[PDB]
Amino acid sequence: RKGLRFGTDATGAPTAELSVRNGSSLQLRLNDGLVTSYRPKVSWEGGDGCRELLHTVVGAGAGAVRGGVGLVLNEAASSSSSSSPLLGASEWSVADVDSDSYDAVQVELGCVASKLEVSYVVTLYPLSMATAVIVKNNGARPVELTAAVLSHIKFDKRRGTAVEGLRGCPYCSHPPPASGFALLTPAEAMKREESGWFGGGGGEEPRQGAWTVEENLYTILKKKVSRVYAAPPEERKKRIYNTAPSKFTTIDQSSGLGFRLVRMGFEDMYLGSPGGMYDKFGNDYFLCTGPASILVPVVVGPGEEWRGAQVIEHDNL
Amino acid sequence: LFPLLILLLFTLFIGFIGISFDNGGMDNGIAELTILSKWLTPSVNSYEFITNAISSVTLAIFGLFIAYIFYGSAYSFFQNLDLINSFVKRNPKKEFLDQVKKNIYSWSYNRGYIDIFYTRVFTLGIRGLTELTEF
Amino acid sequence: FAFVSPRLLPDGTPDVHYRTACGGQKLRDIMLDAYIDLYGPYDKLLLNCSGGGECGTCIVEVVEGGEMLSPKNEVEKEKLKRKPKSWRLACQATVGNPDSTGQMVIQQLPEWKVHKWDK
Amino acid sequence: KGSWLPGLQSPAYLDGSLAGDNGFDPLALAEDPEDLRWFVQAELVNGRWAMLGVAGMLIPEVLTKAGLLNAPEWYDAGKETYFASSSTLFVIEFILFHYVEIRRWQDIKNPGSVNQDPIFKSYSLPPHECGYPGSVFNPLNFAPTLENKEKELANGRLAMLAFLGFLVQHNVTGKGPFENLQQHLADPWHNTIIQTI
Amino acid sequence: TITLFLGATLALAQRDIKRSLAYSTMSQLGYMMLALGIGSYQAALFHLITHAYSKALLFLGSGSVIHSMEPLVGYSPDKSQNMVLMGGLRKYIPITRTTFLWGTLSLCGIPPLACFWSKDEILSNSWLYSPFFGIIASFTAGLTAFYMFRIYLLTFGGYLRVHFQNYSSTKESSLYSISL
Numbered sequence: 001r002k003g004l005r006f007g008t009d010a011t012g013a014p015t016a017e018l019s020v021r022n023g024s025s026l027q028l029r030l031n032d033g034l035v036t037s038y039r040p041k042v043s044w045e046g047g048d049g050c051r052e053l054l055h056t057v058v059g060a061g062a063g064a065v066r067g068g069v070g071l072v073l074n075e076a077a078s079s080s081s082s083s084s085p086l087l088g089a090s091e092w093s094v095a096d097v098d099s100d101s102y103d104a105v106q107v108e109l110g111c112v113a114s115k116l117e118v119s120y121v122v123t124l125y126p127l128s129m130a131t132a133v134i135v136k137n138n139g140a141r142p143v144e145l146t147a148a149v150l151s152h153i154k155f156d157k158r159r160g161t162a163v164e165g166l167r168g169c170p171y172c173s174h175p176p177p178a179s180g181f182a183l184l185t186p187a188e189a190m191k192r193e194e195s196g197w198f199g200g201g202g203g204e205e206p207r208q209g210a211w212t213v214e215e216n217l218y219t220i221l222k223k224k225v226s227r228v229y230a231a232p233p234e235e236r237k238k239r240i241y242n243t244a245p246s247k248f249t250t251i252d253q254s255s256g257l258g259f260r261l262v263r264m265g266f267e268d269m270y271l272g273s274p275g276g277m278y279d280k281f282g283n284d285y286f287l288c289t290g291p292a293s294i295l296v297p298v299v300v301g302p303g304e305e306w307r308g309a310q311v312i313e314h315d316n317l
Numbered sequence: 318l319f320p321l322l323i324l325l326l327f328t329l330f331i332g333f334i335g336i337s338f339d340n341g342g343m344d345n346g347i348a349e350l351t352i353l354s355k356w357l358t359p360s361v362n363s364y365e366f367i368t369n370a371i372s373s374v375t376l377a378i379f380g381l382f383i384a385y386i387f388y389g390s391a392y393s394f395f396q397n398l399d400l401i402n403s404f405v406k407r408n409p410k411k412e413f414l415d416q417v418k419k420n421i422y423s424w425s426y427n428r429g430y431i432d433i434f435y436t437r438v439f440t441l442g443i444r445g446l447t448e449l450t451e452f
Numbered sequence: 453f454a455f456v457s458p459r460l461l462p463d464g465t466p467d468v469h470y471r472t473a474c475g476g477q478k479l480r481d482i483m484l485d486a487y488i489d490l491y492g493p494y495d496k497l498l499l500n501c502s503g504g505g506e507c508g509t510c511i512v513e514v515v516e517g518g519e520m521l522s523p524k525n526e527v528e529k530e531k532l533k534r535k536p537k538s539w540r541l542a543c544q545a546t547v548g549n550p551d552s553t554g555q556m557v558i559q560q561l562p563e564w565k566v567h568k569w570d571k
Numbered sequence: 572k573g574s575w576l577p578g579l580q581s582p583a584y585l586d587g588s589l590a591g592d593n594g595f596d597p598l599a600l601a602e603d604p605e606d607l608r609w610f611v612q613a614e615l616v617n618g619r620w621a622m623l624g625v626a627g628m629l630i631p632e633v634l635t636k637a638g639l640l641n642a643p644e645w646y647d648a649g650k651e652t653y654f655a656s657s658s659t660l661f662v663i664e665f666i667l668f669h670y671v672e673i674r675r676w677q678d679i680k681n682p683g684s685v686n687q688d689p690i691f692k693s694y695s696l697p698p699h700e701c702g703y704p705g706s707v708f709n710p711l712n713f714a715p716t717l718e719n720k721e722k723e724l725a726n727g728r729l730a731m732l733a734f735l736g737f738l739v740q741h742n743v744t745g746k747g748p749f750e751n752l753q754q755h756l757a758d759p760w761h762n763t764i765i766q767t768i
Numbered sequence: 769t770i771t772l773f774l775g776a777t778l779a780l781a782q783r784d785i786k787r788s789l790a791y792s793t794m795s796q797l798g799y800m801m802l803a804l805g806i807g808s809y810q811a812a813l814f815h816l817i818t819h820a821y822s823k824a825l826l827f828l829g830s831g832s833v834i835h836s837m838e839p840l841v842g843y844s845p846d847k848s849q850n851m852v853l854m855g856g857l858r859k860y861i862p863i864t865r866t867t868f869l870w871g872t873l874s875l876c877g878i879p880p881l882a883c884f885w886s887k888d889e890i891l892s893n894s895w896l897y898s899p900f901f902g903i904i905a906s907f908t909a910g911l912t913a914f915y916m917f918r919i920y921l922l923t924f925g926g927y928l929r930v931h932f933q934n935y936s937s938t939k940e941s942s943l944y945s946i947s948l
């Protein structure tokens with residue numbers, strides 16, 4: 001194969017241990033876009049850093065029911081509200097790997113010939129991994145999409161786990177459920193997010209928002225604590241100057257680590273967490289959160305391009 | 318770093334000079350146990366002193382606590398942040414409180430105006446007195 | 453609606469934020485309405501804060517819509533020796549209450565930016 | 572792991588799999604694996620019964636000198652008069668122990684053989700780990716994890732040491748060790764092994 | 769009891785470590801000057817003995833912190849020694865951090881450490897004299913515990929606000945995002 005500063009390996013499926021001259025390394029699967037693990041250097045004493053994604057165990061055969069970054073793209077079918085037709089179950093072609101040094105590596109997957117031309121770019125910097133999508137389309141009529149990343153981060157104890165930095169968004173407490181949003185989960189993330197403990201916020205389709213909840217968020221009332229945090233669906237996202245929402249941040253009061261989740265070109269943020277039906281998915285805590293553009297259909301055009309990129313910085317050396 | 322360490326060794330042992338007034342602290346250790354070593358000076362524990370020290374350390378921990386609330390980080394476990402998540406939501410007197418800020422800082426940056434006083438009085442008084450005794 | 457547009461805390465391409473504001477107040481309060489950060493890495497309690505005063509830790513850089521602000525004071529002329537003519541203090545400065553049809557673009561705190569490399 | 576000598580390399584005998592490994596064999600006794608197992612079991616049992624014994628020494632002494640109770644010294648308890656004479660309880664001890672310990676040894680020779688109570692066929696036993704028996708011994712469902720075996724073995728080693736100390740100090744003195752502690756606290760310099768010779 | 773409270777209420781919001789330390793030591797000498805004014809100087813001398821070391825340690829630690837961070841920011845006072853662009857150093861220089869903490873806690877007043885058994889005695893004697901400034905002494909004994917820990921939390925816990933990727937981007941930007 002080809003490789004400069006890593007090895008295109010195989011364990012059940014083709015993978016790659018993207019590495020840098022700092023210790024940080026991500027274990028990306030080639031069978032799909034589902035990154036499996038990402039080990040930065042968080043602390044100084046201890047040789048390296050270890051605070052990865054929540055990577056569930058192998059299941060049937062090759063398993064893969066793990067989640068963790070898996071890009072979930074779809075097509076907003078112009079037939080019904082069926083925003084879950086397909087990921088375009090097809091091949092995947094690696095191309096034009098580059099490093100530029102021994103502290104940066106990025107792979108470029110490609111998938112064509114059934115849907116439009118989809119390009120996927122996964123980058124690893126000395127600190128921050130990143131995922132970007134290109135959705136180049138042309139043909140009979142403009143087609144649509146959802147373009148969601150999930151990125152199920154791992155958190156410490158589910159009793160001291162929360163998020164800062166939003167504090168202001170319309171928060172659109174309406175979740176289209178069963179995958180967070182954007183069905184066709186990366187072969188698994190979570191299923192049928194519901195709440196039956198006590199009175200939860202939102203009439204399931206408000207924009208109650210006007211957030212003004214203070215510095216923290218205290219995400220503990222979970223298994224359905226999941227809500228798009230973007231601007232409301234055209235009630236204010238219609239006219240000029242429609243109050244761009246935000247960029248993210250995280251907290252875990254029991255370890256002392258931070259992981260900023262910057263979005264670029266996407267539209268929303270799916271802060272979603274378990275903590276209810278949790279004793280079936282491990283021990284400590286986790287939650288799915290990432291950007292996308294799904295709150296409205298995403299008509300792109302007959303010969304145009306889409307863009308979207310999540311970046312996971314930590315700035316916590 | 319050597320002097321820092323050796324002086325850290327001092328900032329903990331020196332408290333044993335006037336250690337306490339309740340049987341000293343040990344029945345052995347003949348090295349001036351309950352004869353507290355400030356004998357160079359001229360020529361259970363007391364309940365009142367106990368409660369006085371309790372009030373002192375209470376104000377101390379209260380100051381430390383407000384300091385940790387305002388400046389301390391959040392990634393630790395000693396900023397509950399539930400209350401912090403409340404005393405921004407229903408903050409009643411923010412319209413008034415900030416003005417107090419607008420005062421207090423405006424003072425400390427002005428260095429305790431008494432400093433400017435000697436400037437606009439003394440070193441501007443003699444500067445004219447010299448001119449007068451010249452003319 | 454003195455439509456404002458923030459160029460926030462230099463990021464990769466831009467880092468723009470949008471905000472609809474009814475003129476009449478100062479820049480400080482109108483920013484602290486749209487929740488966008490102004491006081492750099494300066495925290496609540498006492499560190500260089502409290503509005504309309506001395507320290508001068510809010511140095512917003514105005515790019516578009518400059519001909520809609522109050523004129524410069526002399527405290528601005530004093531605490532900004534280092535300034536290029538562009539930016540001001542924004543803590544003793546106001547937008548006109550009658551300018552409801554303005555269009556102003558602002559870059560936030562300088563000295564933490566690498567820009568004018570753009571446009 | 573924690574080689575008790577910051578410069579010496581640990582021998583291949585004690586890798587670190589077994590709990591409490593520190594390469595503490597300057598005489599190369601257990602360099603044969605089966606003998607290593609033997610001494611593992613021996614250390615386990617010695618430490619458990621040493622913990623038992625040191626408790627039965629210390630706690631009664633302090634509870635008597637506290638005025639809450641009244642019970643003779645562990646050495647002064649033999650000549651004491653009970654509901655049962657010495658020989659009776661001794662032979663009962665002998666028969667019961669010749670049952671229990673021989674079952675233990677049969678388990679040692681054969682992993683998973685003597686499991687069931689051969690009286691009734693249910694209620695018997697879940698398969699165990701050698702040196703760490705099954706259900707009827709750990710009723711509170713404690714998970715036999717690491718930092719439990721290590722704490723056990725460390726406490727047991729120190730208990731062995733403390734028991735040997737009790738014995739030799741009774742030899743040289745014949746007095747209650749807590750009284751030795753009180754005399755010590757009086758003046759550690761005037762009260763030590765030096766003066767009593 | 770005038771210079772005590774005055775030095776106390778000027779260490780607030782003073783963002784220069786080698787200046788706030790001076791304000792703190794003046795507010796501390798206020799206590800000695802008060803204690804002498806009631807006859808029980810046998811505790812004033814003890815308080816002075818404690819405060820000497822408990823402040824010299826802090827000054828030396830501040831010098832070390834300045835010279836440690838001085839290569840990152842320009843060679844300039846008020847560009848260094850200004851603990852608002854500094855802040856968070858527990859990870860980078862431990863041996864000169866534990867000393868700062870165990871000195872500033874002693875100065876704040878905690879039973880096991882020093883500078884405690886002295887100011888407690890002099891506060892007791894002050895209250896025994898008269899509440900008129902006993903209450904002022906008692907209040908400053910908490911205001912000091914506030915700002916002495918304000919300094920430490922400002923300049924020893926955080927993300928090194930110079931670089932924490934929200935305001936300044938000087939770590940990694942030219943990293944060639946999604947390619948041609």
Ligand code: CLA
Pocket residue numbers: 729732733735736737739740743744751752754755762763764765767
């Ligand atoms: C748990 C272990 C332990 C403890 C707490 C003590 C404690 C004590 N022993 Mg002792 N002792 C021990 C084990 C222990 N011993 C062992 C194993 C032996 C046999 C070698 C002896 C033999 C011995 C004699 C012959 C005498 C004492 C005496 C004493 C008392 C005075 C101290 C002294 O003279 O030096 C103790 C002398 C020793 C030889 C002890 C050596 C113990 C070895 C080095 C291991 C202990 C290391 C341990 C980590 C450090 C202490 C731990 C402690 C701080 C918790 C004191 C209460 C004296 C006494 O009762 O007079 C008041 C006395 O005459 N001991």
Ligand SMILES: CCCCCCCCCCCCCCCC(=O)OC[C@H](CO[C@@H]1O[C@H](CS(=O)(=O)O)[C@@H](O)[C@H](O)[C@H]1O)OC(=O)CCCCCCCCCCCCCCC
Pocket residue numbers: 435439440441443
């Ligand atoms: C409890 C109630 C209390 C009430 C108040 C009591 C106050 C008593 C003390 C008065 C204050 C003293 C502050 C000194 C500050 C200082 O040293 O400034 C430094 C300047 C430096 O000069 C200047 O120095 C300049 C450099 S620089 O600016 O200083 O850096 C230089 O450029 C310039 O040429 C030069 O002129 O010094 C002066 O200009 C004047 C010095 C002060 C002269 C005092 C004379 C004696 C006063 C006695 C008062 C008695 C009152 C009772 C009478 C019955």
Ligand SMILES: CC(/C=C/C=C(C)/C=C/[C@@]12O[C@]1(C)C[C@@H](O)CC2(C)C)=C\C=C\C=C(C)\C=C\C=C(C)\C=C\[C@@]12O[C@]1(C)C[C@@H](O)CC2(C)C
Pocket residue numbers: 595596597598599600616617618620621623624625627628644645646648731732734735
């Ligand atoms: C100390 C000890 C063993 C120590 C062995 C050691 C350190 C060996 C170390 C080495 O091998 C290694 C590690 C490696 C080699 O290269 C080096 C050496 C050095 C060779 C065992 C004690 C073991 C001590 C034990 C088992 C004590 C048990 C006590 C009991 C049961 C008490 C019972 C009573 O107290 C009651 C219950 C009631 C009372 O009234 C009556 C009685 C009967 C007195």
Ligand code: SF4
Pocket residue numbers: 500501502503504505506507508509510543544
């Ligand atoms: S006015 Fe001067 S002091 Fe008041 S906030 Fe703006 S900058 Fe800080």
